[PDB]
Amino acid sequence: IFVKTLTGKTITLEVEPSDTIENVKAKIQDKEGIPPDQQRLIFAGKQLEDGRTLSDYNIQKESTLHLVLRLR
Amino acid sequence: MFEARLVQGSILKKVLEALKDLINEACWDISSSGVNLQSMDSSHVSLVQLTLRSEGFDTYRCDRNLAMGVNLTSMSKILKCAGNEDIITLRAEDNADTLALVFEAPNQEKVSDYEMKLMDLDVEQLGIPEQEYSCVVKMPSGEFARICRDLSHIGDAVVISCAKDGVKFSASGELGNGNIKLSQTSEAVTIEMNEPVQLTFALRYLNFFTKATPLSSTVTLSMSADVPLVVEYKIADMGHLKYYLAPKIE
Amino acid sequence: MFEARLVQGSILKKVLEALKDLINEACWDISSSGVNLQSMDSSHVSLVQLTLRSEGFDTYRCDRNLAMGVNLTSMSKILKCAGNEDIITLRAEDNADTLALVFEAPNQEKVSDYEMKLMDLDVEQLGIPEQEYSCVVKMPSGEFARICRDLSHIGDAVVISCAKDGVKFSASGELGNGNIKLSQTEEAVTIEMNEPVQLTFALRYLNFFTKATPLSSTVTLSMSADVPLVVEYKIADMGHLKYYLAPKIEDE
Amino acid sequence: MFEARLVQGSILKKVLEALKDLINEACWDISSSGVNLQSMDSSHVSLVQLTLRSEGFDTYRCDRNLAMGVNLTSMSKILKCAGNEDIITLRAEDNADTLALVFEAPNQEKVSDYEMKLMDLDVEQLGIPEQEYSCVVKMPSGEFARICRDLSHIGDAVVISCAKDGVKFSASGELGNGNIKLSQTSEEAVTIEMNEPVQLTFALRYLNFFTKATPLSSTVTLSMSADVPLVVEYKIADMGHLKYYLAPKIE
């Protein structure tokens, strides 16, 4: 799966589809160094809610997720 | 024999002032770890935990563990005789029922010695144990003090609301109402929160807590939903004075 | 909307310090031209006139003239929560069953805001077209203040006496008597007179008046035979605070 | 027919301060040699002796010797009305049922004036021998004040134990006890002039009464001997002195 900021840059990670948004956000700060608070995630035009899983909404592999950060 | 030589005596003085108007009779727990105190106030309302670590003393000798029953207003009465620069030494001999306080004036001219009787008392413990808080505010002690004092004109309780960017203290009474906002920087009020919170507290007790202001320039407010607020005053490189106060409901 | 931003909140705090003991409840008259307070003290003895003109403020806005009933004691109790260099603003809106006072710590970083309920009061007037005075004296506020405090240890009344050769505050009691003088002159005293005068006033109320000392470093005693003493405290190109007190009939 | 005058009128102030609590009405005997007063306290307990010699007064005139009955508290009220900076002047006439005190600001303009009515005095003179004392301690006044004040919290009486190495003040009560040891030297300069050791118990009440004299001098002297009244001395510089006498506790 890919995670792209608004800067137009995705990046590669390994998650298990059928999973949680949170651990993903944690992967994100591993390298990026961003607190999962300071961040939010948008796919399919909608904000991805905390605690839900993907399979709710439909998703396959190789998918760009837009990383959009919360206010200063 | 138990002996503690402490070169900055003011601290002990200060500690006692931060206690006497809140605690009446208390039992200091004396151990190789240091001098400890944990007690409920006169009214069984607020919790107090004082910690003075052996390391923090210039001389610390504890050859056994003892429980000292004492009236805090008597110990305070005595400590008011000590000067601010005085090296305060504190000596309880093996099984004696009394306590010795030696005030050594710096410059080695005046040397004063007092002994106060003790009482048959207990420990009673009461550890919390410990936990993490939604909100933690780090703020000037003088500011917290002034806020509590000024609001106590207006009402008998204070609602403290902690949000990421600032903190607000409010109260209301017949006279009217008032709110005071801190607004984090951007000393130097500091907020650490994984979560926003607002709680109500009895103003008289906060005003009791603020007696510890002289002990440090920085006070810490730690609370989370449905859980006692914790006011913390840091005794430098030594220990801490902490007050627990349950919030009002609603 | 009535809103006034006063930079030095101190002036306000002090003003109430110079009022709350003399007056309990009063109706401030808030108009375009400024904020006025004219009230007899609670014993109906001395007259009090406070004028704060729109000028001396920094922000001054009054749409419709309104009359604020308030307890000076409560208000003072609120202003005690204001720092001394705190910029203070008063805001009340129209109907205004309450009043808001906001205090900004300088450098900012802290903002406090209170509101006190108001009371339904009416008015005062007490206009006093006044006149020129046969005698007037500019003197250090503190000096006059302790003249009053000390002489109140002798008599319950002071006799002020005026000629350009100086000024004299006399008093007598069971303890015996004493007489203060001045002798004229940045500070100290001036005198202006078309006629010399001697009057007898109660030290109780004067001692009330001296509570406004922190305002001006200079006070002004104006008196004429058969006219009340007007003691005068100037407020900072802002307004003034006047205390009217009727002299005793037999000095003597 | 007398007028003395004291610039540094501040002294009078403090003189009355150290006094008004201890004694209510006293008779100041004033000769051509100077202003003098001596009285028991209001309880017939403490003795008090004050001398302001005409040497210190910038001007002094006393024709016929005076004995002035006065209420010290009232005279205190009148003194309060003068500034510390102020120069003072004391004036009385022959009999002089009324004393005129006059206050001059070093600031020149602004001078006040007062008349306090006097009283009909009783007849009083003391038995002070001026003897030699076994122990004479000399220390700063502020420290003696601290010691008395502080031991007051502990107990009723203070035992002064005086020896050549120094002097120790002890006290006790239902809290416990206390002891304070001073030492020698090495303004300033605490001292012990010792012949025979002494251990004497005094009542902290009256001592605390004495310590009100502290603003008068940077140093106090304790003249002590066994079975004879304690002597506490505060001394007006280039002027005179003030002395207190208190019987120790018996046995």
Tab-separated table of C-alpha atoms in Angstrom, chain D residues 2-187:
chain	number	residue	atom	x	y	z
D	2	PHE	CA	12.896	74.793	80.161
D	3	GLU	CA	13.314	74.066	76.479
D	4	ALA	CA	15.501	71.271	75.204
D	5	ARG	CA	15.870	70.521	71.523
D	6	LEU	CA	16.800	67.387	69.651
D	7	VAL	CA	17.528	67.222	65.959
D	8	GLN	CA	17.358	63.547	65.149
D	9	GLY	CA	14.108	63.847	67.085
D	10	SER	CA	13.559	60.266	66.019
D	11	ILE	CA	15.027	59.238	69.367
D	12	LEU	CA	12.062	60.556	71.348
D	13	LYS	CA	9.781	58.456	69.171
D	14	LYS	CA	11.587	55.223	69.941
D	15	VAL	CA	12.061	56.224	73.566
D	16	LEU	CA	8.291	56.329	73.937
D	17	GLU	CA	7.913	53.153	71.888
D	18	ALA	CA	10.084	51.089	74.228
D	19	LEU	CA	7.992	52.543	77.066
D	20	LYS	CA	4.274	53.097	76.449
D	21	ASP	CA	3.479	49.382	76.665
D	22	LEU	CA	5.370	48.867	79.904
D	23	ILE	CA	4.327	51.923	81.909
D	24	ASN	CA	1.254	54.183	81.622
D	25	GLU	CA	1.825	57.369	83.601
D	26	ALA	CA	5.287	58.374	84.729
D	27	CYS	CA	7.111	61.402	86.066
D	28	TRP	CA	9.998	62.739	84.041
D	29	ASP	CA	12.416	64.467	86.380
D	30	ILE	CA	14.279	67.056	84.336
D	31	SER	CA	17.186	69.008	85.865
D	32	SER	CA	19.862	71.292	84.431
D	33	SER	CA	21.884	68.099	83.926
D	34	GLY	CA	19.333	66.622	81.512
D	35	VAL	CA	16.030	64.823	80.954
D	36	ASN	CA	15.535	61.769	83.166
D	37	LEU	CA	12.818	59.232	83.968
D	38	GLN	CA	12.510	56.168	86.165
D	39	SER	CA	9.454	54.089	86.975
D	40	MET	CA	8.135	50.656	87.874
D	41	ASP	CA	5.930	49.022	85.259
D	42	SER	CA	2.163	49.088	85.772
D	43	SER	CA	2.279	45.765	87.646
D	44	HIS	CA	5.041	46.633	90.166
D	45	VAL	CA	7.332	44.156	88.414
D	46	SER	CA	9.855	45.804	86.103
D	47	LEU	CA	12.059	48.831	86.681
D	48	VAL	CA	12.834	51.403	83.980
D	49	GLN	CA	15.556	54.056	83.864
D	50	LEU	CA	16.020	56.536	81.004
D	51	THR	CA	18.557	59.342	80.755
D	52	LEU	CA	18.890	61.821	77.912
D	53	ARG	CA	21.778	64.070	78.883
D	54	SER	CA	21.774	67.707	77.762
D	55	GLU	CA	25.075	66.848	76.075
D	56	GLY	CA	23.175	65.317	73.162
D	57	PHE	CA	20.572	68.070	72.881
D	58	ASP	CA	21.601	70.698	70.330
D	59	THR	CA	20.105	73.223	72.740
D	60	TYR	CA	19.167	72.915	76.408
D	61	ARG	CA	17.749	75.324	78.975
D	62	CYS	CA	16.436	74.333	82.392
D	63	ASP	CA	16.061	77.076	84.978
D	64	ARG	CA	13.994	75.639	87.809
D	65	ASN	CA	14.098	71.858	88.071
D	66	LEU	CA	10.976	70.147	86.779
D	67	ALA	CA	9.033	67.028	87.632
D	68	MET	CA	6.542	66.342	84.860
D	69	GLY	CA	3.680	63.933	85.347
D	70	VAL	CA	2.739	62.579	81.949
D	71	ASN	CA	0.743	59.811	80.353
D	72	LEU	CA	3.242	57.975	78.184
D	73	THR	CA	0.682	56.447	75.816
D	74	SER	CA	-0.782	59.856	74.996
D	75	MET	CA	2.625	61.476	74.638
D	76	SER	CA	3.288	58.579	72.281
D	77	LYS	CA	0.256	59.518	70.201
D	78	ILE	CA	1.597	63.075	69.992
D	79	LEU	CA	5.070	61.870	69.008
D	80	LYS	CA	3.611	59.738	66.209
D	81	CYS	CA	2.688	63.038	64.581
D	82	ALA	CA	6.341	63.880	63.936
D	83	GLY	CA	8.545	62.503	61.175
D	84	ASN	CA	11.715	60.505	61.790
D	85	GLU	CA	13.566	63.101	59.749
D	86	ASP	CA	11.943	65.696	62.012
D	87	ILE	CA	13.829	67.749	64.559
D	88	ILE	CA	11.917	67.996	67.853
D	89	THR	CA	11.805	70.573	70.629
D	90	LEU	CA	10.494	70.147	74.182
D	91	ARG	CA	9.225	73.206	76.062
D	92	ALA	CA	7.704	73.852	79.501
D	93	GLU	CA	7.187	76.874	81.776
D	94	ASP	CA	7.950	76.847	85.494
D	95	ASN	CA	4.959	74.903	86.800
D	96	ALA	CA	3.879	74.164	83.214
D	97	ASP	CA	0.655	72.188	83.585
D	98	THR	CA	1.026	71.885	79.802
D	99	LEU	CA	4.039	70.727	77.738
D	100	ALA	CA	4.566	72.108	74.229
D	101	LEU	CA	6.286	69.711	71.845
D	102	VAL	CA	7.279	71.219	68.506
D	103	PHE	CA	8.005	69.381	65.259
D	104	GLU	CA	10.211	70.811	62.504
D	105	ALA	CA	10.678	69.112	59.160
D	106	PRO	CA	14.353	69.186	58.045
D	107	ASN	CA	12.367	70.137	54.978
D	108	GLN	CA	12.036	73.521	56.624
D	109	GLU	CA	8.543	74.697	55.687
D	110	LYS	CA	5.937	72.402	57.210
D	111	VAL	CA	6.414	72.768	60.982
D	112	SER	CA	3.853	71.434	63.495
D	113	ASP	CA	3.198	72.216	67.153
D	114	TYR	CA	1.420	70.521	70.087
D	115	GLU	CA	0.394	71.046	73.706
D	116	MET	CA	-0.201	68.020	75.900
D	117	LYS	CA	-1.738	68.550	79.327
D	118	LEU	CA	0.205	67.138	82.281
D	119	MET	CA	-0.779	65.299	85.457
D	120	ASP	CA	-0.231	65.713	89.189
D	121	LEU	CA	2.705	63.402	89.874
D	122	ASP	CA	3.315	61.102	92.820
D	123	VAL	CA	6.688	60.964	94.587
D	124	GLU	CA	9.099	58.385	93.156
D	125	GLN	CA	12.782	57.474	93.230
D	126	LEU	CA	14.396	54.050	92.908
D	127	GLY	CA	17.022	52.121	94.844
D	128	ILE	CA	19.371	51.251	91.987
D	129	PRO	CA	22.858	50.901	93.577
D	130	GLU	CA	24.912	50.650	90.373
D	131	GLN	CA	26.875	47.646	91.642
D	132	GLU	CA	29.395	45.309	90.006
D	133	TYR	CA	27.936	42.356	88.121
D	134	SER	CA	29.178	38.770	88.103
D	135	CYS	CA	28.411	38.501	84.364
D	136	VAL	CA	28.130	41.229	81.743
D	137	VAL	CA	27.096	40.105	78.264
D	138	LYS	CA	27.211	42.380	75.242
D	139	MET	CA	25.476	41.371	72.010
D	140	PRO	CA	23.471	42.746	69.112
D	141	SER	CA	19.929	43.672	70.117
D	142	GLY	CA	18.246	42.041	67.118
D	143	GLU	CA	19.600	38.674	68.205
D	144	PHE	CA	18.392	38.992	71.790
D	145	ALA	CA	14.988	39.950	70.388
D	146	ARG	CA	14.986	36.896	68.131
D	147	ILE	CA	15.965	34.676	71.074
D	148	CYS	CA	13.277	35.991	73.444
D	149	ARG	CA	10.560	35.984	70.778
D	150	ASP	CA	11.484	32.460	69.708
D	151	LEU	CA	11.701	30.928	73.168
D	152	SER	CA	8.281	32.482	73.900
D	153	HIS	CA	6.776	29.857	71.567
D	154	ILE	CA	8.398	27.131	73.652
D	155	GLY	CA	7.639	28.198	77.219
D	156	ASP	CA	6.931	30.742	79.946
D	157	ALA	CA	10.398	31.364	81.314
D	158	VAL	CA	13.910	31.587	79.891
D	159	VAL	CA	16.956	30.403	81.832
D	160	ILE	CA	20.005	32.479	80.989
D	161	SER	CA	23.141	30.480	81.729
D	162	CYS	CA	26.181	32.751	81.499
D	163	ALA	CA	29.779	31.524	81.403
D	164	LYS	CA	33.084	32.762	79.954
D	165	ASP	CA	32.859	30.763	76.713
D	166	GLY	CA	29.447	32.262	75.975
D	167	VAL	CA	25.816	32.345	77.077
D	168	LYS	CA	23.010	29.818	76.584
D	169	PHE	CA	19.268	30.566	76.713
D	170	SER	CA	16.994	27.634	77.585
D	171	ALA	CA	13.210	27.230	77.854
D	172	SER	CA	10.502	24.580	78.242
D	173	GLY	CA	6.773	23.878	77.932
D	174	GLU	CA	4.403	21.089	76.912
D	175	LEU	CA	5.896	20.936	73.414
D	176	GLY	CA	9.330	20.124	74.695
D	177	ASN	CA	12.361	22.265	75.442
D	178	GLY	CA	14.874	24.482	73.695
D	179	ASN	CA	18.409	25.784	74.040
D	180	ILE	CA	20.232	28.526	72.161
D	181	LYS	CA	23.998	28.910	72.453
D	182	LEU	CA	25.757	32.116	71.456
D	183	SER	CA	29.544	32.641	71.415
D	184	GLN	CA	32.360	35.214	71.345
D	185	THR	CA	34.418	37.058	68.714
D	186	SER	CA	36.482	37.364	66.609
D	187	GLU	CA	27.980	47.109	65.989
